[PDB]
Amino acid sequence: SGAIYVGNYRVVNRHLATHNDWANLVWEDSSRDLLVSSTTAQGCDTIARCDCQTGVYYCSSRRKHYPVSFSKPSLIFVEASEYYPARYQSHLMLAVGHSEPGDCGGILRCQHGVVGIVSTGGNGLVGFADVRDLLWLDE
């Protein structure tokens, strides 16, 4: 689990979105595993606006943060999960690292702010859904 709170927006993994997220929907993209809902309370997280390929992510299955090198956002084939088929996921970044299903939502940060959230795993790789291209999140 996990979310990003910026301005009057909440960014979550689309497969973990709640009824309240869907009832206050702003934007969702099934190919990216992202959903953004509106909030009444103001958030104060900052989204990174950069091309960093190094950062640190939170791994809830180890109660630890890990420094990683990750690939630029791209269209990657990902295997089937418990309730969803195998497909190409877009705007995905991969790194060598540990990730279990419940780790989804853990934030990847660089010196400029939030880069993305854990979205995929398997074969000793962790994949993060990028949010740096969503410039509207800060306006």
Ligand X SMILES: Cc1ccccc1NC(=O)c1ccc(C)c(C(N)=O)c1
As a whole number of angstroms, the distance between CA 34 and CA 29 comes to: 6
Alpha carbon 98 to its chain's center: 15
Helix (H, G, I), strand (E, B) or coil at 33: coil
* Tokens standing for residue 13: 């993994």
As a whole number of angstroms, the distance between CA 89 and CA 78 comes to: 7
- Residue (of 102, 101, 99) closest to 127 by Cα position: 99
Write the interaction track for Zn ion spanning residues 100-139; mark x where CB under 5 A is met and - where it is not. ----------x-x---------------------------
Least Å from the CB of residue 105 to Zn ion = 20
Q: Does residue number 21 form part of the binding site for ligand X (CB under 6 A)?
A: no
- Which of 43, 46, 52, 81 touches Zn ion by CB under 5 A? 52
59 marked as binding residue: no
104 among known catalytic residues: yes
Question: What are the two backbone dihedrals, phi and then psi, of residue 69, each rounded to the nearest 5 degrees?
Answer: -100, 135
Least Å from the CB of residue 72 to ligand X = 18
Write the interaction track for ligand X spanning residues 33-62; mark x where CB under 6 A is met and - where it is not. x-----------------------------
By CB under 5 A, name the binding residues for Zn ion.
48, 50, 52, 110, 112
List the catalytic residues.
15, 33, 104
